[PDB]
Structure formats: C-alpha cells, structure tokens
Amino acid sequence: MKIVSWNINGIRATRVGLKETLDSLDADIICLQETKVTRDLLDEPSAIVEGYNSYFSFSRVRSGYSGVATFCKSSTTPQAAEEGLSGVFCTGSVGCYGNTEQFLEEELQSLDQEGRAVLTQHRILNCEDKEETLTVINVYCPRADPEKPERKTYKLRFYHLLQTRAEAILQNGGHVIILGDVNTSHRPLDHCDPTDLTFEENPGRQWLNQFLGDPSGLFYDSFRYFHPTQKNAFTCWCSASGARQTNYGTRIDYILGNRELVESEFLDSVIMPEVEGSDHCPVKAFMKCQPIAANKCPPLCTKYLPEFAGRQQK
C-alpha cells in the first residue's frame, strides 16, 4: 500500500491534466493540499478523475482558496469519509470527536470552514492478517500573518483541534495517519542553515514536540523513523529567486502515524524532490498492510455532487 501527500499549490496551476499527475505519483491514496478548488468554480476535471474516487473539503470563505482532497484507487475506497476536524460540517461519517469543551461552537465553525481537513477511513489487513481501521487525516494547516494577528491564534487553535481529533480517533482503536502541510519545521535539520541557538520557543514547534514521540507523543514522524539524520531533505522552496535550485528550503510536509502503525506496518517514508509543478514536492510512504475496499463510496464522494450529475440526468 502506498500513500502520497502533496501541497500542490493549486490543482489547475500545475498545468498538467490531473489524471496524468495522479497516475505518475503511483499510489493507492493521494492526499493533496491547497487544491484551490471551491464549489462555485464547478471544476469537474479537478474533482472527478478516471480511476479514482475522491473526497474534497472546499473552503466556504473565499473562492479559489485553500482546499484539501483525498483521491483513492478502487483498492482503497473508504468505508467512511468526513470534512473538517470538528463535526460541524458533517451518513458515512467518521466521528470520534474528542472533548472540545475549550472551543465555542462558533470557533469550531471558523476552524472548519476554510477547507483545511478531510478524513477518510479504510479497512486494512495488518501483519497478522487481522482487520483493522486506518483513518487518514489530510490537513492544510494555516499560516500566521503579521498584519492579521488573529491568524497566529487561529493556527495554534487549529493544531489543538487536530490533536484532539486525531487522539480521539486513535483512542477508539485502530490506526491513524496525519499527513499534509503542517507549516512548521520540527528540528534544525529540517531547515536550511543557520539555526537559532530559542529554536524551541516557537509555539508551533512546542506543539509538535509534544504531539510527536521519539523512536511522550503518540505519533511518529515517519520520514525520520527511517531517515533520522538525512540532511537537506526539504519539501518546500519559495517560488522566487531560484530557491529550489539553491535548496533554500524547509521540510514542512509530513506523514505522521501512530507508533504501532509506523513500527509494524511501514516499510519506508521518503521525499519526492523530482516531482515538479508546485512550490512543494510530495512525500510518500510505503506500507505492508493491505486495504479492503468498501463496496460503495461514502456520501462525501465528489461523484455525488449535484452539479456533476451529468447530461443524462439533465
């Protein structure tokens, strides 16, 4: 089983047909961040691709903004799928929300209305050939903006909601992968030199430090489980001033898994710097577990969107 995560900086902006791009990534589950697809655009070619069943979260606050999508081959059709981390935009859902007493409902709506998370749940056969659930949480984390101070708070609250949800699903049994653009690099090795000699003072990095365990947190950074000392392993370079060529970059795209999943089912986790078309490159994991496809796509699937019903229904 193979899974890819990629902040694609706009599906359309790659200027390649999406079927060709997805096939080239050669994976059973492909998670895209910053699709820049919103529902007002009626962008059927970006949402419905031959050979895949897909699950989008669309931003509700601005056209052509944010957005995440999970594309599944027939082999991995999910048993359940849900938009968001809190449940407010939710048959066929994932549940297991955790305790959100610290969040107002209106804050939950705000954290979930920007198209930043989609969850798909897959049955898998583990290394003892027992059936288990794997929940894939595909996230595009926000960014702080100095001219809008409230967005730093938004980002930290999004991280706290993500932790709450992921740990609650994990507590229900089975396995959890969190992948996507976390928009924080973890350790000095993850960023171009030189490094702060207060590096831990960053509140997003403090969050990551306690969320991840080291082979206290319940999740492992799979890339570093397999490549703990690899240098210059970046996933993001700014578009300007030749950064990708000079390796002026950072590693901010992750495939995180619960400890038991990474230790027992992962074979490798890598960076794909050869893949062009975005300001980020993909990351990819290779797993030994085998998926059990659902018999029907759950209701979140894009094929059920009324705007895409087709001419025969017209």
Indicate whether 76 belongs to the interface with Mg ion (CB under 5 A): no
Question: In the structure encoding, which two tokens stand for residue 36, read together?
Answer: 């820049």
Indicate whether 9 belongs to the interface with Mg ion (CB under 5 A): yes
Site string for Mg ion, 167-196 (x = CB under 5 A): ------------------------------
CA distance linking residue 97 with residue 248, whole number of Å: 39
Region from 33-41, 112-120, 124-132, 202-210 binding Mg ion, contact rule CB under 5 A: 33-41
Q: Taking the alpha carbons of 32, 38, 41, 42 in that order, is the dihedral positive or negative?
A: positive
Indicate whether 21 belongs to the interface with Mg ion (CB under 5 A): no
Region from 4-12, 41-49, 101-109, 286-294 binding Mg ion, contact rule CB under 5 A: 4-12
**Do 82 and 168 form a contact (C-beta atoms < 8 A)?**
no
Region from 34-42, 187-195, 218-226, 286-294 binding Mg ion, contact rule CB under 5 A: 34-42
- 209 marked among binding-site residues: no
What secondary structure does DSSP assign to 225-289, as a single string?
Answer: HH-TT-SS---EE-SSTTHHHHT-EE--EEEEEEHHHHHHHEEEEEE-TT--SSSB--EEEEE--
Of the candidates 122, 175, 186, 280, the residue annotated as catalytic is: 280
Say whether 140 is catalytic: yes
- 99 marked among binding-site residues: no
**Do 261 and 177 form a contact (C-beta atoms < 8 A)?**
yes
Question: In the structure encoding, which two tokens stand for residue 308, read together?
Answer: 């895409």
What minimum distance in Å lies between the beta carbon of 113 and Mg ion? 19
Of the candidates 181, 190, 221, 253, the residue annotated as catalytic is: 181
- 181 marked among binding-site residues: yes
What minimum distance in Å lies between the beta carbon of 278 and Mg ion? 8
CA distance linking residue 172 with residue 91, whole number of Å: 19
- 191 marked among binding-site residues: no
Region from 31-39, 57-65, 151-159, 229-237 binding Mg ion, contact rule CB under 5 A: 31-39
What minimum distance in Å lies between the beta carbon of 64 and Mg ion? 12
Of the candidates 52, 55, 140, 159, the residue annotated as catalytic is: 140
Cβ-based nearer residue to Mg ion, 34 or 253:
34
What minimum distance in Å lies between the beta carbon of 107 and Mg ion? 25
CA distance linking residue 87 with residue 109, whole number of Å: 9
> What's the chain's Rg over C-alpha atoms?
18
What minimum distance in Å lies between the beta carbon of 67 and Mg ion? 11
What minimum distance in Å lies between the beta carbon of 180 and Mg ion? 12
Indicate whether 35 belongs to the interface with Mg ion (CB under 5 A): no
**Do 10 and 36 form a contact (C-beta atoms < 8 A)?**
yes
As a whole number of Å, the end-to-end CA separation of the chain is 39
Nearest to 79 by CA among 295, 269, 266, 313: 295
- 112 marked among binding-site residues: no
Q: Which helix (H) or strand (E) holds 167?
A: helix 150-171
Cβ-based nearer residue to Mg ion, 7 or 76:
7
Say whether 181 is catalytic: yes
Cβ neighbours of residue 90 closer than 8 Å, sequence gap 6 or more: 82, 83, 84
Nearest to 169 by CA among 209, 120, 215, 129: 120
Total number of residues that touch Mg ion (CB under 5 A): 2
The binding site for Mg(2+) comprises 9, 34, 181, 183, 279-280
The binding site comprises 9, 34, 181, 183, 279-280
Q: Which residues are catalytic?
A: 140, 181, 280
- Residues of the shown chain interacting with Mg ion in the complex, contacts defined by CB under 5 A: 9, 34
